Design a protein around this ligand. Structure first.
Ligand SMILES: [Ca+2]
Lengths: 49, 49
């Protein structure tokens, strides 16, 4: 449902490398059988300084 | 893609062949041999088997 995020980063965090891991909570619909499904995320740099 | 029709099967068979009982008969010939029955006579005859 909610598909947009706004992660922002400060000068203390950028000083050591910002690694963005991912945690996923899921439940495959009843009976569906698939192979190599893609999920593609758009990363946009909106503002910087 | 594939929406599995979730339906598996188990099966079995039962074999009812025979009837419960066998009535083996040895018929009787009651005046028999080495004995005699007369008209109007009275008595007892017995076959054990
Ligand atoms: Ca700027």
């Amino acid at each position: 449902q909610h598909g947009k995020a706004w992660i922002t980063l400060d000068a203390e965090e950028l000083r050591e490398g910002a690694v963005l891991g991912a945690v996923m909570y899921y439940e495959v619909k009843e009976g569906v059988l698939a192979s190599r499904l893609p999920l593609v995320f758009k990363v946009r740099v909106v503002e910087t300084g | 893609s594939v929406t599995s029709d979730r339906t598996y099967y188990g099966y079995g068979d039962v074999s009812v062949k025979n009837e419960p009982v066998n009535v083996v008969v040895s018929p009787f010939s009651f005046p028999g041999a080495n004995a005699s029955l007369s008209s109007g006579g009275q008595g007892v005859f017995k076959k054990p088997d």
